[PDB]
Design a protein around this ligand. Structure first.
Ligand SMILES: NC(=O)[C@H](CCC(=O)O)NC(=O)[C@H](CCC(=O)O)NC(=O)CCc1ccc(-c2ccccc2)cc1
Ligand SMILES: [Ca+2]
Ligand SMILES: [Ca+2]
Ligand SMILES: [Ca+2]
Ligand SMILES: [Zn+2]
Ligand SMILES: [Zn+2]
Length: 159
């Protein structure tokens, strides 16, 4: 068992916004992504616009100040740090991708569900139905659901 948050109230802040999408659409994607995980754990997430958030959400390009440099369009879409102070928990999205609300480019909501998985302490899954599977492939946003493996994983960490 890797690191977990030692509390059930977790804040997040959106550090900056991709110009690919409407600001409102980014907020919505991120809030809905947290809700996916809140729905199956005791965890609650609140957005703050100021103060010290646990999970910072960042859009950045290439070498962006950590040891997980991005690679331009394609390849790595995002990465996130597991639970911990400071950079711990933070989720970084590669601005060289084209973020969308839909099936074109890279869907932000789906990517955020996967990354928040990491921010909460999950690693990758070999279950092809799992949101924690290593590779992205668009699935209908309206019928999207965590797989049994994702739920097992997160319930083993919290609750
Ligand atoms: N399929 C790919 O290879 C895409 C390219 C973009 C595309 O094909 O549209 N890149 C990626 O998949 C890279 C690969 C990194 C590697 O190991 O080197 N992975 C990442 O960047 C991890 C982020 C990630 C993984 C899975 C999902 C997802 C989406 C819907 C349902 C279930 C899971 C969302 C986000
Ligand atoms: Ca943090
Ligand atoms: Ca990339
Ligand atoms: Ca972009
Ligand atoms: Zn980073
Ligand atoms: Zn991942």
């Amino acid at each position: 068992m890797g690191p977990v948050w030692r509390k059930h109230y977790i804040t997040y802040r959106i550090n900056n916004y991709t110009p690919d999408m409407n600001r409102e659409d980014v907020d919505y994607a991120i809030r809905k992504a947290f809700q996916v995980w809140s729905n199956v754990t005791p965890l609650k997430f609140s957005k703050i616009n100021t103060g010290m958030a646990d999970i910072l959400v960042v859009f950045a390009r290439g070498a962006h100040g950590d040891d997980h440099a991005f690679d331009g369009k394609g390849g790595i879409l995002a990465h996130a740090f597991g639970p911990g102070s400071g950079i711990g928990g933070d989720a970084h999205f590669d601005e060289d991708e084209f973020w969308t609300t839909h099936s074109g480019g890279t869907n932000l909501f789906l990517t955020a569900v996967h990354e928040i998985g990491h921010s909460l302490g999950l690693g990758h899954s070999s279950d092809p139905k799992a949101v924690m599977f290593p590779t992205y492939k668009y699935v209908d946003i309206n019928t999207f659901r965590l797989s049994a493996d994702d739920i097992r994983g997160i319930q083993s960490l919290y609750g």
